[PDB]
Amino acid sequence: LNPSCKIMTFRPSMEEFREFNKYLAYMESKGAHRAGLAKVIPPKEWKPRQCYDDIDNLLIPAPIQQMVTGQSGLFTQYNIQKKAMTVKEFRQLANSGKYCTPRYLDYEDLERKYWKNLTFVAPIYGADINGSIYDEGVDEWNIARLNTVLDVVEEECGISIEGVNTPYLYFGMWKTTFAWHTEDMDLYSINYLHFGEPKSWYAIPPEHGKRLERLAQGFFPSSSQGCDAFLRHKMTLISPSVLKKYGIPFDKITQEAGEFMITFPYGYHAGFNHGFNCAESTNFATVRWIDYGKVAKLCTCRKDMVKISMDIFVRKFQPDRYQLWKQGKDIYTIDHTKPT
Ligand SMILES: CCc1c(C)[nH]c2c(C#N)c(C)nn2c1=O
Ligand SMILES: [Cl-]
Ligand SMILES: [Fe+2]
Ligand SMILES: [Zn+2]
């Protein structure tokens, strides 16, 4: 299944698309998860929102200015908080001469310009804004209620899932960056690009994730000393030139407005926004995730990082293993290649 581990693009008919959980089972049956990342283009007629005009009025409480330092494919970034502004003000800022997308020939050209210009003007973004902007009543692929095993454990068993299964908005401009990371607890994520300019992605197959970790520890030995899972800080940038040089396998793809990207457990991803845009995302889980969550290597640094107790998931979905697990005896290494 997908021996190349390349990013797959899916084009479901309305009939296939209707049921998210079933279609996701189908994607993995084709080996989509080997790449760490997949794209799903919904059928043309499907619209999660009739009109986006009102989103201009939404407030972005804490826009962040992204300060990047380093050189030649290896960078670290930190955040400066700016004053609140409406999406409309943010779009006008994004479109100004100081912040707008440069002229470019094709995506390959724009990508070169991204990596060449990272340490000049510092771009601004709004992230982790709570809420979904789907219309009421949209029942397909509704990011606010995907009904995965996360939801079951929360609603049926009353277990806190720490807010990770709720929907968040991101408002990008040119050159705003998501640094290399896997999801909290090595969950899945889903990202829909509502409107605006594209978002480019890089992804490393989960089966090669440890090689990215070893390369990062080698280039960022300071960061590494402070925290065993320092890539979860989302402050570490590493270019595809550097990946190619040290032979870490990866793939790239660009997401356009109206398209979904799914990231899979332990699928390291990074990327950047082409221009002003708006994306909605959340985390979710399936049963195949449970063995990733049990071994996910967590940040020790700060007091507040997301940790979900695995107890309920092993007890309910892996009852055969539960006591072995609680006795520290459930030892395995994950097969990243097979469906569950
Ligand atoms: C620059 C704002 C921003 C952040 C911080 N992270 C992410 C992810 C992730 N993961 C993606 C898909 N987009 N996105 C963003 O636009
Ligand atoms: Cl530029
Ligand atoms: Fe992510
Ligand atoms: Zn940490």
Coordinates of C-alpha atoms and ligand atoms in Angstrom, one line a residue:
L1 CA 0.0 0.0 0.0
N2 CA 1.5 3.3 -1.2
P3 CA 5.1 2.0 -1.1
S4 CA 6.5 5.3 -2.3
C5 CA 4.8 7.0 0.8
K6 CA 3.8 9.9 -1.5
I7 CA 1.0 12.4 -0.6
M8 CA -2.3 11.2 -2.1
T9 CA -5.1 13.3 -3.4
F10 CA -8.7 12.0 -3.2
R11 CA -11.7 13.2 -5.3
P12 CA -14.8 11.6 -3.7
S13 CA -18.2 11.7 -5.4
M14 CA -21.0 13.1 -3.2
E15 CA -22.0 9.6 -2.4
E16 CA -18.6 8.6 -1.1
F17 CA -18.0 12.0 0.6
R18 CA -21.1 12.0 2.6
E19 CA -19.8 10.0 5.5
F20 CA -16.4 11.2 6.8
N21 CA -15.6 8.3 9.1
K22 CA -16.2 5.8 6.4
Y23 CA -14.3 7.7 3.8
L24 CA -11.3 8.1 6.1
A25 CA -11.4 4.3 6.5
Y26 CA -11.3 4.1 2.7
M27 CA -8.3 6.5 2.5
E28 CA -6.2 4.4 4.9
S29 CA -7.2 1.2 3.0
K30 CA -5.3 2.8 0.1
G31 CA -2.3 3.6 2.2
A32 CA -2.9 7.4 2.4
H33 CA -1.5 7.5 6.0
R34 CA 2.0 6.3 4.9
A35 CA 2.7 9.9 3.6
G36 CA 1.6 11.5 7.0
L37 CA -0.6 13.8 5.0
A38 CA -3.4 13.6 2.4
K39 CA -5.6 16.0 0.4
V40 CA -9.4 15.5 -0.1
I41 CA -11.1 17.6 -2.7
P42 CA -14.8 17.7 -2.0
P43 CA -17.3 17.3 -4.9
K44 CA -18.0 20.7 -6.5
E45 CA -21.6 21.1 -5.3
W46 CA -20.7 20.8 -1.6
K47 CA -20.6 24.1 0.2
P48 CA -20.0 24.4 3.9
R49 CA -20.8 28.1 3.8
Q50 CA -23.0 30.0 1.4
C51 CA -21.3 33.4 1.9
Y52 CA -18.2 34.5 3.8
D53 CA -18.9 38.2 3.8
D54 CA -19.7 38.4 7.5
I55 CA -16.4 37.0 8.5
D56 CA -14.8 40.4 7.9
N57 CA -16.4 41.4 11.2
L58 CA -14.9 38.6 13.3
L59 CA -12.5 39.9 15.9
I60 CA -8.9 38.5 16.1
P61 CA -8.2 39.0 19.9
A62 CA -4.4 38.4 19.8
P63 CA -2.7 38.6 16.4
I64 CA 0.8 37.3 16.5
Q65 CA 3.9 38.8 14.8
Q66 CA 6.2 36.0 13.9
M67 CA 9.9 36.7 14.4
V68 CA 12.2 34.3 12.6
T69 CA 16.0 34.1 13.3
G70 CA 18.7 31.8 11.7
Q71 CA 20.1 31.3 8.2
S72 CA 20.2 28.9 5.2
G73 CA 17.3 26.6 5.9
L74 CA 17.7 26.4 9.7
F75 CA 15.6 28.8 11.8
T76 CA 13.9 29.4 15.1
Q77 CA 11.0 31.6 15.6
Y78 CA 9.3 33.5 18.5
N79 CA 6.0 35.4 18.7
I80 CA 5.2 38.9 19.5
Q81 CA 1.6 39.7 20.5
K82 CA -0.1 42.6 18.8
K83 CA -3.3 44.5 19.5
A84 CA -6.7 43.0 18.6
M85 CA -8.0 43.7 15.0
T86 CA -11.0 42.6 12.9
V87 CA -10.5 40.2 10.0
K88 CA -11.2 43.2 7.7
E89 CA -8.4 45.2 9.2
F90 CA -6.2 42.1 9.0
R91 CA -7.0 41.5 5.4
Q92 CA -6.2 45.1 4.5
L93 CA -2.9 44.8 6.3
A94 CA -2.1 41.5 4.5
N95 CA -2.9 43.1 1.2
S96 CA -0.7 46.2 1.8
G97 CA 2.7 46.7 0.0
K98 CA 4.6 45.8 3.2
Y99 CA 2.9 42.4 3.6
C100 CA 1.4 41.3 0.3
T101 CA 2.4 38.2 -1.7
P102 CA 5.3 39.0 -4.1
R103 CA 4.9 38.6 -7.9
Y104 CA 5.8 35.0 -8.9
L105 CA 5.7 32.6 -11.8
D106 CA 4.5 29.4 -10.2
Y107 CA 4.3 27.8 -6.8
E108 CA 7.9 26.6 -7.1
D109 CA 9.0 30.2 -7.6
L110 CA 6.9 31.5 -4.7
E111 CA 8.4 28.7 -2.5
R112 CA 12.0 29.9 -3.3
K113 CA 10.9 33.4 -2.4
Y114 CA 9.5 32.2 0.9
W115 CA 12.8 30.7 2.0
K116 CA 14.9 33.7 0.6
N117 CA 12.8 36.3 2.4
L118 CA 12.0 34.7 5.9
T119 CA 14.3 37.1 7.8
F120 CA 13.1 40.4 6.4
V121 CA 9.7 41.8 7.2
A122 CA 8.0 39.9 10.0
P123 CA 4.5 38.7 9.1
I124 CA 1.4 38.6 11.3
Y125 CA -1.3 35.9 11.8
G126 CA -4.3 35.0 14.0
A127 CA -4.3 31.5 15.3
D128 CA -6.2 29.2 17.7
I129 CA -9.4 31.3 17.5
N130 CA -12.2 29.2 19.0
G131 CA -15.2 28.5 16.7
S132 CA -16.3 27.1 13.4
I133 CA -17.6 29.1 10.5
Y134 CA -19.6 26.3 8.8
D135 CA -23.3 27.1 8.2
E136 CA -25.8 25.6 10.6
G137 CA -27.1 22.3 9.4
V138 CA -24.1 21.2 7.4
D139 CA -23.8 17.5 8.2
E140 CA -20.9 16.3 6.0
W141 CA -17.4 16.7 7.3
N142 CA -18.4 19.1 10.0
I143 CA -15.2 19.9 11.8
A144 CA -17.1 20.8 14.9
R145 CA -18.7 17.3 15.2
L146 CA -16.8 14.6 13.4
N147 CA -18.0 11.9 15.8
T148 CA -14.8 10.0 16.2
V149 CA -13.6 7.9 19.1
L150 CA -12.5 11.2 20.9
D151 CA -16.2 12.3 21.0
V152 CA -17.4 8.9 22.1
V153 CA -15.0 8.9 25.1
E154 CA -16.0 12.4 26.0
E155 CA -19.8 12.1 25.7
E156 CA -20.2 8.5 26.9
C157 CA -17.5 8.1 29.4
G158 CA -17.3 11.7 30.6
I159 CA -13.5 12.0 30.1
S160 CA -12.0 15.5 29.4
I161 CA -10.3 15.6 26.0
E162 CA -8.6 19.0 26.9
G163 CA -10.3 21.0 24.1
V164 CA -8.4 19.3 21.2
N165 CA -11.6 18.2 19.5
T166 CA -13.0 21.6 19.1
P167 CA -12.7 23.8 16.0
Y168 CA -10.1 26.6 15.6
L169 CA -9.5 29.2 12.9
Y170 CA -6.3 30.4 11.4
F171 CA -5.9 33.6 9.4
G172 CA -2.8 33.7 7.4
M173 CA -0.9 36.2 5.3
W174 CA 2.1 35.8 3.0
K175 CA 5.1 34.2 4.6
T176 CA 3.4 33.2 7.9
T177 CA 4.7 29.8 8.8
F178 CA 3.7 26.6 10.6
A179 CA 6.9 25.1 12.0
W180 CA 7.6 21.3 12.1
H181 CA 5.3 19.4 14.5
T182 CA 3.1 16.4 15.0
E183 CA -0.3 17.0 16.6
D184 CA -0.8 17.0 20.4
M185 CA -0.7 13.4 21.6
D186 CA 0.2 12.5 18.0
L187 CA -3.5 12.7 17.0
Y188 CA -4.9 13.2 13.5
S189 CA -5.9 16.7 12.3
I190 CA -8.2 18.0 9.6
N191 CA -7.8 21.4 8.0
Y192 CA -10.3 23.0 5.6
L193 CA -9.1 26.1 3.8
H194 CA -12.3 28.3 3.7
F195 CA -11.2 31.1 1.4
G196 CA -8.2 33.1 0.3
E197 CA -4.8 32.2 -1.0
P198 CA -3.2 28.8 -0.9
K199 CA -1.4 27.1 1.9
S200 CA 1.8 25.0 1.1
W201 CA 2.7 21.9 3.1
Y202 CA 5.7 19.6 3.7
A203 CA 5.2 16.2 5.3
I204 CA 7.5 13.4 6.5
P205 CA 6.2 9.8 6.4
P206 CA 5.4 8.6 9.9
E207 CA 7.8 5.8 9.3
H208 CA 10.7 8.3 8.9
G209 CA 9.6 10.6 11.7
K210 CA 12.5 9.6 14.0
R211 CA 15.0 10.6 11.4
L212 CA 13.6 14.1 11.4
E213 CA 13.8 14.1 15.2
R214 CA 17.5 13.0 15.1
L215 CA 18.4 15.7 12.5
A216 CA 16.6 18.4 14.5
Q217 CA 18.4 17.3 17.8
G218 CA 21.7 17.6 15.9
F219 CA 21.0 21.1 14.6
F220 CA 19.3 22.4 17.7
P221 CA 21.2 20.8 20.5
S222 CA 20.4 23.7 22.8
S223 CA 16.6 23.4 22.3
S224 CA 17.0 19.6 22.6
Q225 CA 18.7 19.8 26.0
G226 CA 15.9 21.8 27.4
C227 CA 13.1 19.6 26.2
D228 CA 13.0 16.0 24.9
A229 CA 9.9 17.0 22.7
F230 CA 11.0 20.5 21.8
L231 CA 9.6 20.2 18.3
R232 CA 6.2 20.4 20.0
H233 CA 7.0 24.0 20.8
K234 CA 6.3 24.7 17.1
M235 CA 9.3 27.1 16.9
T236 CA 11.6 25.1 14.6
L237 CA 12.0 25.7 10.8
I238 CA 13.9 23.3 8.5
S239 CA 13.9 23.8 4.8
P240 CA 13.4 21.1 2.1
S241 CA 17.0 21.9 0.9
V242 CA 18.3 20.8 4.3
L243 CA 16.1 17.8 4.3
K244 CA 17.3 16.8 0.8
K245 CA 20.9 17.3 1.9
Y246 CA 20.6 14.9 4.9
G247 CA 18.4 12.4 2.9
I248 CA 15.3 12.7 5.0
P249 CA 12.4 11.6 2.9
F250 CA 9.5 14.1 2.6
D251 CA 6.9 15.3 0.1
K252 CA 5.2 18.6 -0.6
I253 CA 1.8 19.7 -1.9
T254 CA -0.2 22.9 -2.0
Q255 CA -3.8 23.2 -0.6
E256 CA -6.2 25.6 -2.4
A257 CA -9.3 27.2 -1.1
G258 CA -12.1 24.6 -0.7
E259 CA -9.8 21.7 0.0
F260 CA -9.2 19.5 3.0
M261 CA -5.9 18.2 4.3
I262 CA -5.8 15.3 6.7
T263 CA -2.7 14.8 8.8
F264 CA -2.1 11.3 10.3
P265 CA -0.7 10.2 13.7
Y266 CA 3.0 11.0 14.0
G267 CA 3.0 12.7 10.6
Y268 CA 5.4 15.6 10.9
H269 CA 4.2 18.6 8.8
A270 CA 5.3 22.2 8.3
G271 CA 4.4 24.9 5.7
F272 CA 3.4 28.5 5.0
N273 CA 0.6 30.7 3.7
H274 CA 0.7 32.2 0.2
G275 CA -1.4 35.2 1.2
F276 CA -4.4 36.3 3.1
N277 CA -6.5 33.2 4.0
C278 CA -8.7 31.5 6.5
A279 CA -8.6 27.9 7.5
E280 CA -10.5 25.9 10.1
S281 CA -9.1 22.8 11.8
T282 CA -9.4 20.3 14.7
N283 CA -7.8 17.2 16.0
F284 CA -9.5 13.8 16.0
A285 CA -8.8 10.1 16.6
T286 CA -9.6 6.6 15.4
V287 CA -8.8 3.3 16.9
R288 CA -5.6 3.0 14.9
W289 CA -4.4 6.2 16.8
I290 CA -4.5 4.5 20.2
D291 CA -1.1 2.8 20.0
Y292 CA 0.4 6.2 18.9
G293 CA -1.1 8.0 21.8
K294 CA 0.3 5.4 24.3
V295 CA 3.8 6.1 23.1
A296 CA 3.7 9.8 22.2
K297 CA 6.8 11.6 23.6
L298 CA 5.4 14.7 25.4
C299 CA 6.9 18.2 26.3
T300 CA 8.2 18.3 29.8
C301 CA 9.0 22.1 29.8
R302 CA 6.0 24.0 30.7
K303 CA 3.2 23.2 33.0
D304 CA 0.3 23.4 30.6
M305 CA 0.8 21.2 27.5
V306 CA -1.9 18.9 26.3
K307 CA -1.9 15.5 27.8
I308 CA -4.8 13.1 27.4
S309 CA -4.9 10.0 29.7
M310 CA -4.9 6.9 27.5
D311 CA -6.5 4.8 30.1
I312 CA -10.1 4.9 28.8
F313 CA -9.0 4.2 25.2
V314 CA -7.0 1.1 26.1
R315 CA -9.7 -0.1 28.5
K316 CA -12.6 0.2 26.0
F317 CA -11.0 -0.5 22.6
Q318 CA -8.0 -2.7 23.6
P319 CA -9.5 -4.7 26.5
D320 CA -7.3 -7.7 25.6
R321 CA -4.2 -5.5 26.4
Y322 CA -5.4 -3.3 29.1
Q323 CA -3.8 -5.0 32.2
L324 CA -0.6 -5.7 30.3
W325 CA -0.6 -2.0 29.5
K326 CA -1.1 -0.8 33.0
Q327 CA 1.7 -3.1 34.2
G328 CA 4.1 -1.4 31.8
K329 CA 4.4 -4.6 29.8
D330 CA 2.5 -3.7 26.6
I331 CA 5.7 -3.3 24.4
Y332 CA 5.5 -3.0 20.7
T333 CA 6.8 -0.9 17.8
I334 CA 4.2 0.6 15.6
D335 CA 3.7 -0.7 12.0
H336 CA 3.1 2.6 10.2
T337 CA 2.3 0.9 6.9
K338 CA -0.8 -1.2 7.6
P339 CA -4.5 -0.2 8.1
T340 CA -5.8 -1.2 11.6
Ligands
LIG1 C1 0.6 30.7 10.6 C2 -0.7 30.3 11.4 C3 -0.8 28.8 11.3 C4 -0.4 27.9 12.3 C5 0.3 28.5 13.6 N1 -0.4 26.6 12.2 C6 -1.0 26.0 11.1 C7 -1.3 24.7 10.7 C8 -0.9 23.5 11.3 N2 -0.6 22.5 11.8 C9 -1.8 24.8 9.4 C10 -2.3 23.6 8.6 N3 -2.0 26.1 9.1 N4 -1.6 26.8 10.1 C11 -1.4 28.2 10.1 O1 -1.8 28.9 9.2
CL2 CL 8.8 38.5 -0.1
FE3 FE -0.5 20.6 12.6
ZN4 ZN 8.9 21.4 26.0

